């Protein structure tokens, strides 16, 4: 069980940790989150009471260091930092617990939700999408744009997701124009799986990370990336059976976890109706299809 | 973006552009089989690729042999159209390649775009105009060359004959589309109007009769009257 202490809470803010969140009042004595499960990535995110614009947050993994949060009154936001003095850090953590000023990561023991949403997400890959190599943790916010979005402006702040484009030379072998555009199996399996991602777990990891960024920050480019990676699979006639089964599980827990009130902007009608009902894999997403119909029949 | 009544004069500026119409690419007859089921028989078709400024027409003849053993022919037709248009562009010298291709049906956008990936600076555009180019097989000489073909064949024509010696592109295209609209709404009457007078002949190297300027006025008036009449009959107005 690991801990992320907070130096203070000077401004009124809603704090999230993974799918949980807590309201904290201006200069309430809040000093961290404890009992955070080791073994998965995590995200701690913020939304100031005064600016329901710009949700922001930090991906991290407690195995990679001792991290803590500190409000910065110049930049006006809660910053994640690393403490390198291991002794000085257990000291702060232990004194804050003794005073009981820390909330407990509130995991129900039956609940695999977070595992299921992050099964394939690995910190190492996050730090390639969010390049900032002097920190072990990664910042994301509502307004950050992706590399593809930038192509159609500041690259230091870009989400370097893998660029997918169905009408590109990459996607289309010369002489197989019609074949490849109607059956993306080539693009999926050779170009993307074998070529760029190397295996399905990295692909699933990027898909899951894109969804989580869309959900927690309303990051629109991430929503686009998540839909594109689903569509690439659902629009391929030839998919390894281990991928289809896992995809149904992945999407199920993602649809299950979304706030009900957000289905309008986060869920692309065309892609979902095509994946569930028109595509090659229309019949391979039984759990994802059952939950979509029983929760958002409108969008369909 | 899309082509409409507002940006109509762009067709006649000096940016090379082509219209592509695929409506006659996949042509069938529908008949009854011995067991009483329905079957189709393909006949020869053509891609109608036209430069509206110069009148040059690139009539690509689609031989029934193309369909042999293929499924989802109506879908395939769109891809074969885009394949052949792309090959036409590749075959032309750089300075003759179009800057825009305007497809008369929106279903052609994705096939063409995909086939034209090698030409990112050629813009593929839809149109909101309701152009009459499907009636191109009502022009006797075009229908004749399509139906006689025994192999894939490209045949070149100027669809304006020699009109441009005497009128502007704008006026030529309005005449062409008026003639085709008429032939589409009522071929039999349209063709009657064109040939009634046996003393007005079609040159061997032309598609339409050698009307004088005054005779074209009478013709155009006669085609307008034909079109408006058929409208009242269609809608009871």
Swiss-Prot record, chain A:
Post-translational events: Phosphorylated on serine and tyrosine residues.
Keyword Nucleus assigned: yes
Coiled-coil parts of chain: none
Major localization listed first in the record, in broad terms: cytoplasm
Membrane-spanning residues: none
Modified residues (Phosphoserine): 236
InterPro entries, per the entry: AAR2, AAR2_C, AAR2_C_sf, Aar2_N, AAR2_N_sf
Any Pfam family the entry gives: AAR2_1st
Keywords, in A-Z order: Cytoplasm, mRNA processing, mRNA splicing, Nucleus, Phosphoprotein
Signal sequence bounds: none
PANTHER family assigned: A1 CISTRON SPLICING FACTOR AAR2-RELATED, PROTEIN AAR2 HOMOLOG
Note: Present with 7330 molecules/cell in log phase SD medium.
Subunit structure: Heterodimer. Interacts with PRP8 (via RNase H homology domain and MPN domain), competing with BRR2 for the same binding site. Component of a U5 snRNP complex that contains at least the U5 snRNA, PRP8, SNU114, AAR2, SMB1, SMD1, SMD2, SMD3, SME1, SMX2 and SMX3, but is not a component of the U4/U6-U5 tri-snRNP complex.
Protein name in UniProt: A1 cistron-splicing factor AAR2
Gene from which the chain derives: AAR2
UniProtKB/Swiss-Prot annotation, chain B:
Domain comment in the entry: The MPN (JAB/Mov34) domain has structural similarity with deubiquitinating enzymes, but lacks the residues that would bind the catalytic metal ion.
Residue segments, region RNase H homology domain: 7-237
Residues of the full protein shown: 1836 to 2069 of 2413
Miscellaneous section: Present with 468 molecules/cell in log phase SD medium.
Regions annotated as coiled coil: none
Annotated phenotype, changing residue 22 to A: Reduced growth at 30 degrees Celsius. Strongly reduced growth at 16 degrees Celsius. Strongly reduced growth at 35 degrees Celsius
Localisation: Nucleus
Protein name according to UniProt: Pre-mRNA-splicing factor 8
The protein's role, per its UniProt record: Functions as a scaffold that mediates the ordered assembly of spliceosomal proteins and snRNAs. Required for association of BRR2 with the spliceosomal U5 snRNP, and the subsequent assembly of the U4/U6-U5 tri-snRNP complex. Functions as a scaffold that positions spliceosomal U2, U5 and U6 snRNAs at splice sites on pre-mRNA substrates, so that splicing can occur. Interacts with both the 5' and the 3' splice site, as well as the branch region. Has a role in branch site-3' splice site selection. Associates with the branch site-3' splice 3'-exon region. Also has a role in cell cycle.
Top-rank taxon: Eukaryota
TM spans (from-to): none
